[PDB]
């Protein structure tokens, strides 16, 4: 079903953990919730499920106001963050519990429990009680319980957090295959940036009770609305450099680099509400920084940290007149020493620019992938 939240507010006394949240999740839409730890991702899910009350505002599921409806009558299933498995019942019994409450046949139950358990690699653990399982196994049971139930609305609170990287990819596809088979609404919380990009039709970013930005995966990566979103999507984080406006054209802004040489550069970015002389913040991603060989803007400094990841190498560079280190990603293993001199190119069309209040000057460079 469709799930729509209008002016939803949640308060624990004077502490307001959800403020004026407005969301419109249409039927069959896969929506990923991301945000900093303790921003209110579960609180939202719990209000949707009916496990937490709403202070003010309205919630609609299938165009019916659900504020005062008991959890059982919501058509909502949830994969709890704490798993919340029935510790007195086995894996099989946990996954078959919802069907036993209905007048479901034993063979009907067994057919669709074994099927779901075999895709989660739980076929050998069917008789086990939750105490006799690992943390990643308990989590697969929690998912398996909700998968069997096949609700109108799927809620998954960080459902892969405790799995190995290889199994995490195997589960991602099986979840994605389900959504394409059933065409049902799925609201999915994750901290894994890869999950979010691969699974979502639409991503919601939260920041301490508020929705920061809603958009397509690439739409948030390429075009963040503000400084917060820009630093949250994509990991490693975006580099930020304090710059000064020197000149404006309608479709570009010229900024001065904080270095003693005060190098000037034009960026394809809106000049709307941008005054000459004002202090902006320049954003560039570690992936986007170029090798110095051929580059018009050169940033040189002293290497502070080298992280060897195998497939790539991350270099952290201390550049004078900027307090924060610059992070850069080279493909393959590149032999660099700590303390060595390193230079990187800075591409103008791939730069983001943010005002003093934090809002982004809309990037006007048409980046491939965004329709």
């Amino acid at each position: 079903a469709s799930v729509q939240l209008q002016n939803v507010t949640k308060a624990w006394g004077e502490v307001v953990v959800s403020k004026d949240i407005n969301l419109d999740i249409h039927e069959g839409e896969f929506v990923v919730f991301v945000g900093p730890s303790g921003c209110g991702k579960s609180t939202l899910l719990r209000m949707i499920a009916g496990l937490e009350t709403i202070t003010s505002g309205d919630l609609f599921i299938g165009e019916k106001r659900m504020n005062d409806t008991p959890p059982a009558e919501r058509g909502v299933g949830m994969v709890f963050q704490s798993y919340a498995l029935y510790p007195h019942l086995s894996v099989a019994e946990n996954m078959s519990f919802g069907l036993k409450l209905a007048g479901a046949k034993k063979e009907v139950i067994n057919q669709r429990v074994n099927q779901v358990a075999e895709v989660l690699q739980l076929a050998h653990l069917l008789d086990r009680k939750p105490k006799a399982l690992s943390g990643g196994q308990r989590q697969r049971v929690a998912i398996g319980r909700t998968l069997v139930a096949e609700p109108s609305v799927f809620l998954l609170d960080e459902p892969l957090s405790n799995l190995d990287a290889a199994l995490r990819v195997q589960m991602r596809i099986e979840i994605s295959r389900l959504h394409k088979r059933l065409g049902r609404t799925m609201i999915y919380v994750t901290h894994d940036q890869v999950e979010a990009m691969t699974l979502a039709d639409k991503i919601v970013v939260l920041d301490a009770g508020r929705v920061a930005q809603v958009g397509k995966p690439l739409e948030l990566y390429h075009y963040p609305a503000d400084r917060f979103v820009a630093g949250f999507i994509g990991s490693p984080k975006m580099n930020f450099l304090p710059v000064k406006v020197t000149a404006t054209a309608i479709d570009q802004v010229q900024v001065e680099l904080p270095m003693p040489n005060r190098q000037q550069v034009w960026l394809p970015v809106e000049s709307r509400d941008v005054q000459v002389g004002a202090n902006m913040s320049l954003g560039i991603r570690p992936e986007h920084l170029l090798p110095s060989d051929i580059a018009d803007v050169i940033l040189e400094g002293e290497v502070q940290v080298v992280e060897q990841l195998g497939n790539e190498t991350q270099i952290h560079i201390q550049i004078p007149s900027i307090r924060q280190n610059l992070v850069y990603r080279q493909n393959d293993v590149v032999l660099v020493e700590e303390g060595a001199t390193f230079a990187i190119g800075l591409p103008p069309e791939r730069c983001h620019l943010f005002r003093e209040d934090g809002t982004a000057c809309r990037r006007l460079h048409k980046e491939p992938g965004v329709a």
């Binding site: 959890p71 498995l85 510790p87 105490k131 943390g135 319980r145």
Partner: protein, 288 residues
């Protein structure tokens, strides 16, 4: 260091011996010839007569004549098991359902009623038997099954003593993580289904406690059962053994045998309940 086991084993043994001593004097009284409240731990003159008559045997005495058992002590005991058994099952069932609503549901005056229950039960039961007799006398002519001189009436009379058991179960219910029943409700479980199929199997230790505490209460109870029961063959063991008590002297030997006998069903039930007194029932369910 396994000197801790040795010192515990030693201190428990000394504690057991100390607390057992008074009870061993009762066993001594039950096996002593004649009726004497005092004497040696191992009676100088041992007699099986008190246990013979309690177990239903006839006793031949010094002059030759045979004394048939004056009282059906074993039937009395069986009457005690029945009254205490059903009574306990009833108190468990009534206090558990009540606690569930107090621990999981919301209704106006929830906090007032719980504290009212604790207060009104802590009233001195001094003139209560006057009121109780008047109730069951009136009740008897409409529902005879639960009137005066019936086991039903005695059982019915105890089902009012639940206040504390409600608090005890409510308290235990509150230790169990709520997300288990939340998960259940999301699986489509009614509040009853969540109660029966999730909460109760994890609450099984405290249900045994309440059953035990009620079974003991009913086995040892005298005033109310004595007030309601008239027929000798319907007496519970606690009521029946009052016949050994007279204004000037007690038939200690027979009373003691009755006392030791009444402790037996307690022990059996206590042993059987242990299967429900288990650790780590909520283990592996909730991360935190």
């Amino acid at each position: 260091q396994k000197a801790r086991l040795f010192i515990t084993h030693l201190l428990l043994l000394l504690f057991i011996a100390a607390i057992m001593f008074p009870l061993l004097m009762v066993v001594a009284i039950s096996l002593r010839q004649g009726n004497f409240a005092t004497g040696s731990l191992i009676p100088e003159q041992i007699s099986w007569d008190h246990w013979k008559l309690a177990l239903g045997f006839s006793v031949e005495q010094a002059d030759g004549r045979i004394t048939p058992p004056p009282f059906p002590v074993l039937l009395w005991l069986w009457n005690s098991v029945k009254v205490a058994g059903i009574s306990a099952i009833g108190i468990v069932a009534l206090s558990t359902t009540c606690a569930y609503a107090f621990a999981r549901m919301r209704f106006p005056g929830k906090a007032t009623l719980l504290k009212g229950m604790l207060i009104f039960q802590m009233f001195p039961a001094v003139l209560s038997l006057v009121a109780l007799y008047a109730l069951f006398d009136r009740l008897g002519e409409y529902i005879p099954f639960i009137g005066l001189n019936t086991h039903g009436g005695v059982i019915f009379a105890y089902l009012g003593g639940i206040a504390l058991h409600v608090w005890t179960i409510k308290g235990y219910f509150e230790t169990i993580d709520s997300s288990l029943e939340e998960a259940a409700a999301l699986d489509g479980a009614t509040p009853w289904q969540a109660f029966r199929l999730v909460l109760l199997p994890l609450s099984v230790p405290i249900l045994a406690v309440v059953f035990i505490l009620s079974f003991i209460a009913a086995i040892t109870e005298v005033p109310v059962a004595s007030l309601l029961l008239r027929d000798v063959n319907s007496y519970t063991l606690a009521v029946g053994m009052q016949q050994y008590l007279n204004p000037q002297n007690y038939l200690w030997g027979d009373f003691a045998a009755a006392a030791v006998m009444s402790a037996l069903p307690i022990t059996i039930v206590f042993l059987l309940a242990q299967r429900w007194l288990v650790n780590g029932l909520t283990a592996g369910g909730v991360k935190g």
